[PDB]
Amino acid sequence: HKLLLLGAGESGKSTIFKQIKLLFQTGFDEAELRSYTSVIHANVYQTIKILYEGAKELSQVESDYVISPDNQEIGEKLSDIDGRLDYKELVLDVKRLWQDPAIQETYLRPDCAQYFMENLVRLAEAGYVPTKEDVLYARVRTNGVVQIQFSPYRLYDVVNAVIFCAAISEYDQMLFEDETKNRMMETKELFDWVLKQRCFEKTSFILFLNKFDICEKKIQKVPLSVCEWFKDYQPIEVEHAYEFVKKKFEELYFQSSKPRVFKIYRTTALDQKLVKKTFKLIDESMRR
Ligand SMILES: Nc1nc2c(ncn2[C@@H]2O[C@H](COP(=O)(O)OP(=O)(O)O)[C@@H](O)[C@H]2O)c(=O)[nH]1
Ligand SMILES: [Mg+2]
């Protein structure tokens, strides 16, 4: 019955966790969405907060990002909020907070947050219930362990099965935390390190290759050979490049060869019913 979620950075494991929550019951789902609006509101408020803080700092350190002077008085009420406690007047402020191009070139430097910036007025009014997409895009800092038991059987996010989330699209990107390191390389480092440890030998392994939609969008412009792991790559399309990444993920797994159980899944975490399928396939596969 046991499943554990392991990933690196923005692997999407919490998103998998979230939409398994919307998909399965976990009957209430009350107002689950309704309890989650406070969260959603929060990211709206600290997103334009970090956006505002950026523009001024970069303006001080770089020869100009200049804000509109009349905005500062409504602009720093933002800093006056501080999220003291779970927080249409604010949407009129925030839209009228945004208009300077400065803070969007600081933006054009969290991809989910821009969505929220496209849906304020729907969130504004009292008759608001978040869509399923609002829940998925909502960012909740994961504190501790989260247990969910449900039957179509507990899922953990921070054991009979380890779901490893590898965001194949991250091959372009360096680490957000470390500009030197590459996230695909850190995924390989993490994946290898998890495979080597003696505490998950008994555990069955399921691998998710996430953010595939970004992969099909991005592959046609940036070569996959940028990655040192994928430097071997030379095209003839999308399916082959994806299966190429599989090869690497395969051969990497099998080199940890001691004289059991392995599965790989093509996943998009931000859409659901692609994902329902994935769970259907592994829960029927989890025989014995
Ligand atoms: N395009 C796309 N983005 C995703 C998907 N899953 C997650 N994300 C992005 O990843 C971020 C959140 O990842 P998260 O679940 O927190 O990864 P975690 O920190 O390892 O749990 C969000 O900004 C999403 O936009 C996906 O299937 N497709
Ligand atoms: Mg997470």
PDB file of C-alpha atoms and ligand atoms in Angstrom:
ATOM      1  CA  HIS A   1       0.000   0.000   0.000  1.00  0.00           C
ATOM      2  CA  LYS A   2       3.031   2.250   0.507  1.00  0.00           C
ATOM      3  CA  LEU A   3       4.297   4.897  -1.936  1.00  0.00           C
ATOM      4  CA  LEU A   4       6.987   7.559  -1.437  1.00  0.00           C
ATOM      5  CA  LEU A   5       7.720  10.569  -3.657  1.00  0.00           C
ATOM      6  CA  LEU A   6      11.317  11.585  -4.419  1.00  0.00           C
ATOM      7  CA  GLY A   7      12.446  14.352  -6.766  1.00  0.00           C
ATOM      8  CA  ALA A   8      14.857  17.228  -7.290  1.00  0.00           C
ATOM      9  CA  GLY A   9      13.916  20.902  -7.216  1.00  0.00           C
ATOM     10  CA  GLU A  10      10.862  21.486  -9.406  1.00  0.00           C
ATOM     11  CA  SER A  11      10.341  17.850 -10.350  1.00  0.00           C
ATOM     12  CA  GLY A  12       6.562  18.166 -10.029  1.00  0.00           C
ATOM     13  CA  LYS A  13       6.043  15.591  -7.276  1.00  0.00           C
ATOM     14  CA  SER A  14       3.837  17.946  -5.257  1.00  0.00           C
ATOM     15  CA  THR A  15       1.798  18.539  -8.423  1.00  0.00           C
ATOM     16  CA  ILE A  16       1.354  14.769  -8.840  1.00  0.00           C
ATOM     17  CA  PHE A  17       0.339  14.724  -5.175  1.00  0.00           C
ATOM     18  CA  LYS A  18      -2.078  17.624  -5.719  1.00  0.00           C
ATOM     19  CA  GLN A  19      -3.971  16.267  -8.714  1.00  0.00           C
ATOM     20  CA  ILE A  20      -4.176  12.748  -7.331  1.00  0.00           C
ATOM     21  CA  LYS A  21      -5.963  14.640  -4.543  1.00  0.00           C
ATOM     22  CA  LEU A  22      -8.390  16.313  -6.943  1.00  0.00           C
ATOM     23  CA  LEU A  23      -8.671  13.124  -8.990  1.00  0.00           C
ATOM     24  CA  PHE A  24      -9.383  10.738  -6.108  1.00  0.00           C
ATOM     25  CA  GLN A  25     -11.571  10.971  -3.037  1.00  0.00           C
ATOM     26  CA  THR A  26     -10.497  12.016  -0.323  1.00  0.00           C
ATOM     27  CA  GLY A  27     -14.196  12.715  -0.604  1.00  0.00           C
ATOM     28  CA  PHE A  28     -13.946  16.269   0.686  1.00  0.00           C
ATOM     29  CA  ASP A  29     -12.646  17.968  -1.537  1.00  0.00           C
ATOM     30  CA  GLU A  30     -15.146  19.938   0.432  1.00  0.00           C
ATOM     31  CA  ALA A  31     -14.506  23.110  -0.268  1.00  0.00           C
ATOM     32  CA  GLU A  32     -10.993  21.666  -0.567  1.00  0.00           C
ATOM     33  CA  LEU A  33     -10.686  24.254  -3.297  1.00  0.00           C
ATOM     34  CA  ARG A  34     -12.226  26.790  -0.893  1.00  0.00           C
ATOM     35  CA  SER A  35      -9.623  26.139   1.802  1.00  0.00           C
ATOM     36  CA  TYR A  36      -6.961  26.406  -0.918  1.00  0.00           C
ATOM     37  CA  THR A  37      -8.013  29.924  -2.021  1.00  0.00           C
ATOM     38  CA  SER A  38      -6.157  31.430   0.947  1.00  0.00           C
ATOM     39  CA  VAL A  39      -3.027  29.723  -0.369  1.00  0.00           C
ATOM     40  CA  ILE A  40      -3.703  30.927  -3.926  1.00  0.00           C
ATOM     41  CA  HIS A  41      -4.226  34.468  -2.648  1.00  0.00           C
ATOM     42  CA  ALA A  42      -0.872  34.203  -0.831  1.00  0.00           C
ATOM     43  CA  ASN A  43       1.169  33.496  -3.972  1.00  0.00           C
ATOM     44  CA  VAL A  44      -0.537  36.446  -5.655  1.00  0.00           C
ATOM     45  CA  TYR A  45       0.608  38.638  -2.770  1.00  0.00           C
ATOM     46  CA  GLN A  46       4.176  37.421  -2.394  1.00  0.00           C
ATOM     47  CA  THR A  47       4.650  37.221  -6.179  1.00  0.00           C
ATOM     48  CA  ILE A  48       4.116  40.925  -6.757  1.00  0.00           C
ATOM     49  CA  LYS A  49       6.058  41.352  -3.505  1.00  0.00           C
ATOM     50  CA  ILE A  50       9.210  39.669  -4.802  1.00  0.00           C
ATOM     51  CA  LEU A  51       8.624  41.375  -8.161  1.00  0.00           C
ATOM     52  CA  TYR A  52       8.587  44.784  -6.473  1.00  0.00           C
ATOM     53  CA  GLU A  53      11.661  43.979  -4.370  1.00  0.00           C
ATOM     54  CA  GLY A  54      13.559  42.867  -7.465  1.00  0.00           C
ATOM     55  CA  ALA A  55      13.059  46.005  -9.551  1.00  0.00           C
ATOM     56  CA  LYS A  56      14.321  48.345  -6.826  1.00  0.00           C
ATOM     57  CA  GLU A  57      17.375  46.235  -5.930  1.00  0.00           C
ATOM     58  CA  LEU A  58      18.432  45.826  -9.564  1.00  0.00           C
ATOM     59  CA  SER A  59      17.804  49.551 -10.045  1.00  0.00           C
ATOM     60  CA  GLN A  60      20.251  50.290  -7.223  1.00  0.00           C
ATOM     61  CA  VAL A  61      22.960  47.885  -8.422  1.00  0.00           C
ATOM     62  CA  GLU A  62      22.624  48.372 -12.203  1.00  0.00           C
ATOM     63  CA  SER A  63      22.636  51.523 -14.314  1.00  0.00           C
ATOM     64  CA  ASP A  64      19.011  51.741 -15.427  1.00  0.00           C
ATOM     65  CA  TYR A  65      13.981  49.001 -13.948  1.00  0.00           C
ATOM     66  CA  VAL A  66      12.768  52.393 -12.719  1.00  0.00           C
ATOM     67  CA  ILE A  67       9.359  52.172 -11.062  1.00  0.00           C
ATOM     68  CA  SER A  68       6.717  54.841 -11.601  1.00  0.00           C
ATOM     69  CA  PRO A  69       7.064  57.191  -8.586  1.00  0.00           C
ATOM     70  CA  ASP A  70       3.292  57.437  -8.059  1.00  0.00           C
ATOM     71  CA  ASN A  71       3.192  53.635  -7.634  1.00  0.00           C
ATOM     72  CA  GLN A  72       5.510  53.432  -4.604  1.00  0.00           C
ATOM     73  CA  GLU A  73       2.869  54.509  -2.068  1.00  0.00           C
ATOM     74  CA  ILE A  74       0.451  51.791  -3.178  1.00  0.00           C
ATOM     75  CA  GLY A  75       3.494  49.751  -4.179  1.00  0.00           C
ATOM     76  CA  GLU A  76       5.033  49.264  -0.755  1.00  0.00           C
ATOM     77  CA  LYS A  77       1.750  48.561   1.046  1.00  0.00           C
ATOM     78  CA  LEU A  78       2.828  45.224  -0.429  1.00  0.00           C
ATOM     79  CA  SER A  79       5.823  45.291   1.931  1.00  0.00           C
ATOM     80  CA  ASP A  80       3.429  46.518   4.639  1.00  0.00           C
ATOM     81  CA  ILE A  81       1.364  43.325   4.358  1.00  0.00           C
ATOM     82  CA  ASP A  82       4.172  40.848   5.193  1.00  0.00           C
ATOM     83  CA  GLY A  83       1.705  37.944   5.350  1.00  0.00           C
ATOM     84  CA  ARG A  84       0.981  38.655   9.021  1.00  0.00           C
ATOM     85  CA  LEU A  85      -1.846  36.107   8.873  1.00  0.00           C
ATOM     86  CA  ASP A  86      -3.451  34.465   5.783  1.00  0.00           C
ATOM     87  CA  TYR A  87      -4.229  37.999   4.517  1.00  0.00           C
ATOM     88  CA  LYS A  88     -11.544  43.560  -5.265  1.00  0.00           C
ATOM     89  CA  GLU A  89      -9.538  46.403  -3.713  1.00  0.00           C
ATOM     90  CA  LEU A  90      -6.342  44.382  -3.976  1.00  0.00           C
ATOM     91  CA  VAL A  91      -6.752  43.306  -7.577  1.00  0.00           C
ATOM     92  CA  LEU A  92      -7.244  46.940  -8.596  1.00  0.00           C
ATOM     93  CA  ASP A  93      -4.023  47.740  -6.729  1.00  0.00           C
ATOM     94  CA  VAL A  94      -2.031  44.802  -8.116  1.00  0.00           C
ATOM     95  CA  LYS A  95      -3.065  45.305 -11.749  1.00  0.00           C
ATOM     96  CA  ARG A  96      -2.348  49.010 -11.223  1.00  0.00           C
ATOM     97  CA  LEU A  97       0.823  47.854  -9.452  1.00  0.00           C
ATOM     98  CA  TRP A  98       2.033  45.993 -12.519  1.00  0.00           C
ATOM     99  CA  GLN A  99       1.886  48.350 -15.472  1.00  0.00           C
ATOM    100  CA  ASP A 100       5.480  49.588 -15.460  1.00  0.00           C
ATOM    101  CA  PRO A 101       7.564  47.547 -17.938  1.00  0.00           C
ATOM    102  CA  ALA A 102      10.399  47.468 -15.414  1.00  0.00           C
ATOM    103  CA  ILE A 103       9.004  44.711 -13.218  1.00  0.00           C
ATOM    104  CA  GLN A 104       8.245  42.524 -16.246  1.00  0.00           C
ATOM    105  CA  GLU A 105      11.807  42.682 -17.521  1.00  0.00           C
ATOM    106  CA  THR A 106      12.679  41.588 -14.001  1.00  0.00           C
ATOM    107  CA  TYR A 107      10.005  39.000 -14.770  1.00  0.00           C
ATOM    108  CA  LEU A 108      11.505  38.371 -18.218  1.00  0.00           C
ATOM    109  CA  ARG A 109      14.738  37.455 -16.432  1.00  0.00           C
ATOM    110  CA  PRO A 110       8.338  30.796 -10.942  1.00  0.00           C
ATOM    111  CA  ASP A 111       6.505  30.213 -14.229  1.00  0.00           C
ATOM    112  CA  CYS A 112       3.280  29.275 -12.416  1.00  0.00           C
ATOM    113  CA  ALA A 113       2.937  32.731 -10.848  1.00  0.00           C
ATOM    114  CA  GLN A 114       2.391  34.447 -14.210  1.00  0.00           C
ATOM    115  CA  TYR A 115      -0.792  32.413 -14.617  1.00  0.00           C
ATOM    116  CA  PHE A 116      -2.224  33.917 -11.407  1.00  0.00           C
ATOM    117  CA  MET A 117      -1.303  37.302 -12.894  1.00  0.00           C
ATOM    118  CA  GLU A 118      -3.685  36.412 -15.753  1.00  0.00           C
ATOM    119  CA  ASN A 119      -6.642  35.482 -13.496  1.00  0.00           C
ATOM    120  CA  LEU A 120      -6.875  38.170 -10.776  1.00  0.00           C
ATOM    121  CA  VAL A 121     -10.348  39.518 -11.528  1.00  0.00           C
ATOM    122  CA  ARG A 122     -11.836  36.019 -11.387  1.00  0.00           C
ATOM    123  CA  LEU A 123     -10.185  35.448  -8.000  1.00  0.00           C
ATOM    124  CA  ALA A 124     -11.283  38.907  -6.840  1.00  0.00           C
ATOM    125  CA  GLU A 125     -15.027  38.589  -6.423  1.00  0.00           C
ATOM    126  CA  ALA A 126     -16.738  36.955  -3.457  1.00  0.00           C
ATOM    127  CA  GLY A 127     -18.290  34.264  -5.641  1.00  0.00           C
ATOM    128  CA  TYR A 128     -14.913  32.637  -6.278  1.00  0.00           C
ATOM    129  CA  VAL A 129     -14.110  28.934  -6.224  1.00  0.00           C
ATOM    130  CA  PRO A 130     -10.669  27.993  -7.585  1.00  0.00           C
ATOM    131  CA  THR A 131     -10.504  25.819 -10.652  1.00  0.00           C
ATOM    132  CA  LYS A 132      -8.574  22.557 -10.538  1.00  0.00           C
ATOM    133  CA  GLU A 133      -5.837  24.414 -12.426  1.00  0.00           C
ATOM    134  CA  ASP A 134      -5.731  27.067  -9.696  1.00  0.00           C
ATOM    135  CA  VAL A 135      -5.073  24.297  -7.176  1.00  0.00           C
ATOM    136  CA  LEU A 136      -2.276  22.754  -9.255  1.00  0.00           C
ATOM    137  CA  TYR A 137      -0.596  26.087  -9.978  1.00  0.00           C
ATOM    138  CA  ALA A 138      -0.992  27.112  -6.327  1.00  0.00           C
ATOM    139  CA  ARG A 139       2.379  26.753  -4.604  1.00  0.00           C
ATOM    140  CA  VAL A 140       2.402  25.301  -1.083  1.00  0.00           C
ATOM    141  CA  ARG A 141       5.714  24.966   0.741  1.00  0.00           C
ATOM    142  CA  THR A 142       5.871  21.322   1.818  1.00  0.00           C
ATOM    143  CA  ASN A 143       6.502  21.115   5.570  1.00  0.00           C
ATOM    144  CA  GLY A 144       7.038  17.716   7.114  1.00  0.00           C
ATOM    145  CA  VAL A 145       5.401  14.670   5.557  1.00  0.00           C
ATOM    146  CA  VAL A 146       1.948  14.680   3.950  1.00  0.00           C
ATOM    147  CA  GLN A 147      -0.012  11.423   4.195  1.00  0.00           C
ATOM    148  CA  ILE A 148      -2.982  10.639   1.955  1.00  0.00           C
ATOM    149  CA  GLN A 149      -4.769   7.281   2.020  1.00  0.00           C
ATOM    150  CA  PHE A 150      -7.248   6.610  -0.764  1.00  0.00           C
ATOM    151  CA  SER A 151      -8.489   3.799  -2.966  1.00  0.00           C
ATOM    152  CA  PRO A 152      -9.569   3.983  -6.643  1.00  0.00           C
ATOM    153  CA  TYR A 153      -2.890   2.852  -0.044  1.00  0.00           C
ATOM    154  CA  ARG A 154      -0.941   5.852   1.277  1.00  0.00           C
ATOM    155  CA  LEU A 155       1.047   8.480  -0.638  1.00  0.00           C
ATOM    156  CA  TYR A 156       3.817  10.488   1.042  1.00  0.00           C
ATOM    157  CA  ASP A 157       5.488  13.734  -0.021  1.00  0.00           C
ATOM    158  CA  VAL A 158       8.211  15.727   1.719  1.00  0.00           C
ATOM    159  CA  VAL A 159       7.726   1.744   1.606  1.00  0.00           C
ATOM    160  CA  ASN A 160       6.572  -0.505  -1.245  1.00  0.00           C
ATOM    161  CA  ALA A 161       7.093   1.927  -4.139  1.00  0.00           C
ATOM    162  CA  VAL A 162       9.257   4.980  -4.828  1.00  0.00           C
ATOM    163  CA  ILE A 163       8.001   7.412  -7.461  1.00  0.00           C
ATOM    164  CA  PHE A 164      10.995   9.368  -8.762  1.00  0.00           C
ATOM    165  CA  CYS A 165      10.118  12.568 -10.625  1.00  0.00           C
ATOM    166  CA  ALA A 166      12.684  13.667 -13.235  1.00  0.00           C
ATOM    167  CA  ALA A 167      11.742  16.849 -15.128  1.00  0.00           C
ATOM    168  CA  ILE A 168      13.362  15.973 -18.468  1.00  0.00           C
ATOM    169  CA  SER A 169      12.672  19.524 -19.648  1.00  0.00           C
ATOM    170  CA  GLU A 170      15.215  20.810 -17.099  1.00  0.00           C
ATOM    171  CA  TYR A 171      18.153  19.805 -19.371  1.00  0.00           C
ATOM    172  CA  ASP A 172      18.474  23.403 -20.550  1.00  0.00           C
ATOM    173  CA  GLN A 173      18.321  24.942 -17.106  1.00  0.00           C
ATOM    174  CA  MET A 174      21.037  25.445 -14.546  1.00  0.00           C
ATOM    175  CA  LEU A 175      20.069  25.046 -10.903  1.00  0.00           C
ATOM    176  CA  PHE A 176      18.070  27.938  -9.486  1.00  0.00           C
ATOM    177  CA  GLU A 177      20.133  27.566  -6.310  1.00  0.00           C
ATOM    178  CA  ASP A 178      23.444  27.122  -8.169  1.00  0.00           C
ATOM    179  CA  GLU A 179      24.102  28.748 -11.538  1.00  0.00           C
ATOM    180  CA  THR A 180      27.150  26.531 -12.154  1.00  0.00           C
ATOM    181  CA  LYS A 181      25.315  23.214 -11.811  1.00  0.00           C
ATOM    182  CA  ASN A 182      22.856  21.745 -14.320  1.00  0.00           C
ATOM    183  CA  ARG A 183      19.578  20.319 -13.022  1.00  0.00           C
ATOM    184  CA  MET A 184      19.647  17.313 -15.386  1.00  0.00           C
ATOM    185  CA  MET A 185      23.061  16.480 -13.967  1.00  0.00           C
ATOM    186  CA  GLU A 186      21.703  16.932 -10.441  1.00  0.00           C
ATOM    187  CA  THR A 187      18.797  14.668 -11.392  1.00  0.00           C
ATOM    188  CA  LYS A 188      21.333  12.053 -12.507  1.00  0.00           C
ATOM    189  CA  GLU A 189      23.298  12.574  -9.286  1.00  0.00           C
ATOM    190  CA  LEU A 190      20.159  12.260  -7.155  1.00  0.00           C
ATOM    191  CA  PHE A 191      18.722   9.329  -9.128  1.00  0.00           C
ATOM    192  CA  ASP A 192      22.011   7.429  -8.846  1.00  0.00           C
ATOM    193  CA  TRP A 193      22.309   8.237  -5.136  1.00  0.00           C
ATOM    194  CA  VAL A 194      18.789   6.971  -4.404  1.00  0.00           C
ATOM    195  CA  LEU A 195      19.420   3.754  -6.352  1.00  0.00           C
ATOM    196  CA  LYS A 196      22.622   3.026  -4.413  1.00  0.00           C
ATOM    197  CA  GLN A 197      21.190   3.262  -0.894  1.00  0.00           C
ATOM    198  CA  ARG A 198      20.509   0.072   1.054  1.00  0.00           C
ATOM    199  CA  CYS A 199      17.147   1.205   2.474  1.00  0.00           C
ATOM    200  CA  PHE A 200      15.139   1.088  -0.786  1.00  0.00           C
ATOM    201  CA  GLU A 201      16.449  -2.261  -2.066  1.00  0.00           C
ATOM    202  CA  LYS A 202      13.155  -3.888  -1.056  1.00  0.00           C
ATOM    203  CA  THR A 203      11.173  -1.024  -2.592  1.00  0.00           C
ATOM    204  CA  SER A 204       9.794  -1.107  -6.135  1.00  0.00           C
ATOM    205  CA  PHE A 205      10.784   1.787  -8.385  1.00  0.00           C
ATOM    206  CA  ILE A 206       8.587   3.861 -10.704  1.00  0.00           C
ATOM    207  CA  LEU A 207      10.178   6.661 -12.724  1.00  0.00           C
ATOM    208  CA  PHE A 208       8.333   9.714 -14.067  1.00  0.00           C
ATOM    209  CA  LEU A 209       9.822  11.747 -16.931  1.00  0.00           C
ATOM    210  CA  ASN A 210       7.947  14.971 -16.267  1.00  0.00           C
ATOM    211  CA  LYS A 211       7.351  18.272 -18.074  1.00  0.00           C
ATOM    212  CA  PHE A 212       7.133  16.458 -21.407  1.00  0.00           C
ATOM    213  CA  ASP A 213       4.946  19.224 -22.852  1.00  0.00           C
ATOM    214  CA  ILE A 214       7.823  21.648 -22.294  1.00  0.00           C
ATOM    215  CA  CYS A 215      10.082  19.063 -23.941  1.00  0.00           C
ATOM    216  CA  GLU A 216       8.032  18.947 -27.152  1.00  0.00           C
ATOM    217  CA  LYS A 217       7.851  22.757 -27.180  1.00  0.00           C
ATOM    218  CA  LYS A 218      11.503  23.420 -26.364  1.00  0.00           C
ATOM    219  CA  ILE A 219      13.279  20.677 -28.343  1.00  0.00           C
ATOM    220  CA  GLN A 220      12.687  22.313 -31.733  1.00  0.00           C
ATOM    221  CA  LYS A 221      14.776  25.370 -30.768  1.00  0.00           C
ATOM    222  CA  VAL A 222      17.425  24.353 -28.196  1.00  0.00           C
ATOM    223  CA  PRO A 223      19.507  21.258 -29.035  1.00  0.00           C
ATOM    224  CA  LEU A 224      19.399  18.394 -26.554  1.00  0.00           C
ATOM    225  CA  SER A 225      23.177  17.974 -26.993  1.00  0.00           C
ATOM    226  CA  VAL A 226      23.777  20.925 -24.628  1.00  0.00           C
ATOM    227  CA  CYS A 227      23.706  18.466 -21.731  1.00  0.00           C
ATOM    228  CA  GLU A 228      26.909  16.563 -21.007  1.00  0.00           C
ATOM    229  CA  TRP A 229      24.717  13.519 -20.366  1.00  0.00           C
ATOM    230  CA  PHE A 230      23.003  14.015 -23.742  1.00  0.00           C
ATOM    231  CA  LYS A 231      26.025  15.276 -25.707  1.00  0.00           C
ATOM    232  CA  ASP A 232      25.964  12.006 -27.671  1.00  0.00           C
ATOM    233  CA  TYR A 233      22.660  13.095 -29.191  1.00  0.00           C
ATOM    234  CA  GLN A 234      22.378  13.814 -32.932  1.00  0.00           C
ATOM    235  CA  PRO A 235      18.839  13.791 -34.386  1.00  0.00           C
ATOM    236  CA  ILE A 236      17.678  12.270 -37.664  1.00  0.00           C
ATOM    237  CA  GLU A 237      11.986  13.375 -33.786  1.00  0.00           C
ATOM    238  CA  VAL A 238      10.383  14.103 -30.371  1.00  0.00           C
ATOM    239  CA  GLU A 239       9.719  10.452 -29.539  1.00  0.00           C
ATOM    240  CA  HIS A 240      13.289   9.458 -30.408  1.00  0.00           C
ATOM    241  CA  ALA A 241      14.790  12.292 -28.353  1.00  0.00           C
ATOM    242  CA  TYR A 242      12.498  11.251 -25.500  1.00  0.00           C
ATOM    243  CA  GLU A 243      13.531   7.609 -25.895  1.00  0.00           C
ATOM    244  CA  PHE A 244      17.142   8.829 -26.049  1.00  0.00           C
ATOM    245  CA  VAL A 245      16.726  10.359 -22.586  1.00  0.00           C
ATOM    246  CA  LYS A 246      15.201   7.001 -21.649  1.00  0.00           C
ATOM    247  CA  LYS A 247      18.307   5.160 -22.837  1.00  0.00           C
ATOM    248  CA  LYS A 248      20.434   7.307 -20.532  1.00  0.00           C
ATOM    249  CA  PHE A 249      17.972   6.807 -17.671  1.00  0.00           C
ATOM    250  CA  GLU A 250      17.888   3.071 -18.426  1.00  0.00           C
ATOM    251  CA  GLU A 251      21.640   2.327 -18.703  1.00  0.00           C
ATOM    252  CA  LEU A 252      22.151   4.524 -15.619  1.00  0.00           C
ATOM    253  CA  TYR A 253      19.746   2.349 -13.630  1.00  0.00           C
ATOM    254  CA  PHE A 254      21.159  -0.998 -14.759  1.00  0.00           C
ATOM    255  CA  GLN A 255      24.793  -0.090 -13.988  1.00  0.00           C
ATOM    256  CA  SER A 256      23.686  -0.415 -10.378  1.00  0.00           C
ATOM    257  CA  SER A 257      23.637  -4.140 -11.211  1.00  0.00           C
ATOM    258  CA  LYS A 258      23.638  -6.626  -8.361  1.00  0.00           C
ATOM    259  CA  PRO A 259      23.114 -10.335  -9.304  1.00  0.00           C
ATOM    260  CA  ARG A 260      14.290  -6.664  -9.329  1.00  0.00           C
ATOM    261  CA  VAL A 261      11.520  -4.207 -10.233  1.00  0.00           C
ATOM    262  CA  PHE A 262      11.744  -1.194 -12.546  1.00  0.00           C
ATOM    263  CA  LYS A 263       9.199   0.928 -14.419  1.00  0.00           C
ATOM    264  CA  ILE A 264       9.386   4.199 -16.374  1.00  0.00           C
ATOM    265  CA  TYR A 265       6.511   6.539 -17.236  1.00  0.00           C
ATOM    266  CA  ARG A 266       6.075   9.396 -19.701  1.00  0.00           C
ATOM    267  CA  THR A 267       4.230  11.948 -17.581  1.00  0.00           C
ATOM    268  CA  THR A 268       2.874  15.470 -17.736  1.00  0.00           C
ATOM    269  CA  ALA A 269       2.066  16.455 -14.159  1.00  0.00           C
ATOM    270  CA  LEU A 270       0.245  19.726 -14.864  1.00  0.00           C
ATOM    271  CA  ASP A 271      -2.456  18.068 -16.972  1.00  0.00           C
ATOM    272  CA  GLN A 272      -4.813  15.495 -15.512  1.00  0.00           C
ATOM    273  CA  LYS A 273      -6.101  12.549 -17.521  1.00  0.00           C
ATOM    274  CA  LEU A 274      -2.916  12.100 -18.925  1.00  0.00           C
ATOM    275  CA  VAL A 275      -1.962  11.378 -15.319  1.00  0.00           C
ATOM    276  CA  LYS A 276      -5.003   9.327 -14.302  1.00  0.00           C
ATOM    277  CA  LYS A 277      -3.825   6.774 -16.861  1.00  0.00           C
ATOM    278  CA  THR A 278      -0.377   6.548 -15.231  1.00  0.00           C
ATOM    279  CA  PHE A 279      -1.944   5.719 -11.871  1.00  0.00           C
ATOM    280  CA  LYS A 280      -4.369   3.255 -13.482  1.00  0.00           C
ATOM    281  CA  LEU A 281      -1.410   1.470 -15.062  1.00  0.00           C
ATOM    282  CA  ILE A 282       0.742   1.204 -11.938  1.00  0.00           C
ATOM    283  CA  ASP A 283      -2.030   0.383  -9.434  1.00  0.00           C
ATOM    284  CA  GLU A 284      -3.154  -2.531 -11.601  1.00  0.00           C
ATOM    285  CA  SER A 285       0.532  -3.386 -12.047  1.00  0.00           C
ATOM    286  CA  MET A 286       1.078  -3.432  -8.273  1.00  0.00           C
ATOM    287  CA  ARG A 287      -0.085  -7.038  -8.030  1.00  0.00           C
ATOM    288  CA  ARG A 288       1.144  -9.441  -5.311  1.00  0.00           C
TER     289      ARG A 288
HETATM  290  N1  LIG B   1       4.781  22.329 -17.956  1.00  0.00           N
HETATM  291  C1  LIG B   1       4.685  21.614 -16.811  1.00  0.00           C
HETATM  292  N2  LIG B   1       5.086  22.188 -15.649  1.00  0.00           N
HETATM  293  C2  LIG B   1       5.008  21.515 -14.478  1.00  0.00           C
HETATM  294  C3  LIG B   1       4.480  20.144 -14.483  1.00  0.00           C
HETATM  295  N3  LIG B   1       4.514  19.718 -13.206  1.00  0.00           N
HETATM  296  C4  LIG B   1       5.020  20.729 -12.451  1.00  0.00           C
HETATM  297  N4  LIG B   1       5.309  21.801 -13.212  1.00  0.00           N
HETATM  298  C5  LIG B   1       5.886  23.084 -12.736  1.00  0.00           C
HETATM  299  O1  LIG B   1       6.695  22.833 -11.587  1.00  0.00           O
HETATM  300  C6  LIG B   1       6.459  23.809 -10.574  1.00  0.00           C
HETATM  301  C7  LIG B   1       6.073  23.086  -9.296  1.00  0.00           C
HETATM  302  O2  LIG B   1       6.792  21.860  -9.204  1.00  0.00           O
HETATM  303  P1  LIG B   1       6.697  21.042  -7.826  1.00  0.00           P
HETATM  304  O3  LIG B   1       5.454  20.185  -7.785  1.00  0.00           O
HETATM  305  O4  LIG B   1       6.703  21.998  -6.658  1.00  0.00           O
HETATM  306  O5  LIG B   1       7.999  20.103  -7.794  1.00  0.00           O
HETATM  307  P2  LIG B   1       8.532  19.629  -6.354  1.00  0.00           P
HETATM  308  O6  LIG B   1       9.053  20.821  -5.590  1.00  0.00           O
HETATM  309  O7  LIG B   1       9.633  18.613  -6.532  1.00  0.00           O
HETATM  310  O8  LIG B   1       7.382  19.010  -5.597  1.00  0.00           O
HETATM  311  C8  LIG B   1       5.315  24.692 -11.038  1.00  0.00           C
HETATM  312  O9  LIG B   1       5.795  26.017 -11.287  1.00  0.00           O
HETATM  313  C9  LIG B   1       4.809  24.074 -12.325  1.00  0.00           C
HETATM  314  O10 LIG B   1       4.649  25.083 -13.325  1.00  0.00           O
HETATM  315  C10 LIG B   1       4.065  19.591 -15.795  1.00  0.00           C
HETATM  316  O11 LIG B   1       3.606  18.438 -15.903  1.00  0.00           O
HETATM  317  N5  LIG B   1       4.194  20.365 -16.877  1.00  0.00           N
HETATM  318 MG    MG B   2       8.240  19.671  -3.901  1.00  0.00          MG
END
